[PDB]
Amino acid sequence: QLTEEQIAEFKEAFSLFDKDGDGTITTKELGTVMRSLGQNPTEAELQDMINEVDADGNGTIDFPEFLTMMARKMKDTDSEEEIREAFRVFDKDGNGYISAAELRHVMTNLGEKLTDEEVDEMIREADIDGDGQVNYEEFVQMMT
């Protein structure tokens, strides 16, 4: 079950999308973050993404709705789809390898400014075969 800290991490995530801190995530705000993650969703795509979470159908996602969804996916430790999705967020050029630049880009988006050494260290931490990049197998092990 959700702990005090868990809700804290989920609030951090929610705030990343709720830029104006009005308590709700709009398709406009989701689009802004998706484009910052290397995606380019159409309005129809964004509407579908909001819909899956917008339990009461008012067209936006509030914290309770966000928490419900995030808590549910976290309980599915057997699911790998979320890890595959995260991998794609990192792997912007779709070549199956997360490069140092690709990893830095995501971290920068999260508001974490890392030095080149920190980035190389983050890569190294998951880079089992030492080729300088993180493939999917390496990414999973890192996440699990």
């Binding site: 991490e9 995530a13 990343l16 998706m34 993650l37 993404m49 995030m70 890890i83 995260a86 931490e125």
Partner: peptide
């Protein structure tokens, strides 16, 4: 991609750890 973004932050936290 809501949860994916959370996981990205997870990759970071774990790093900041040990």
């Amino acid at each position: 991609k809501f949860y994916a973004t959370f996981l990205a932050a997870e990759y970071f936290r774990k790093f900041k750890k040990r």
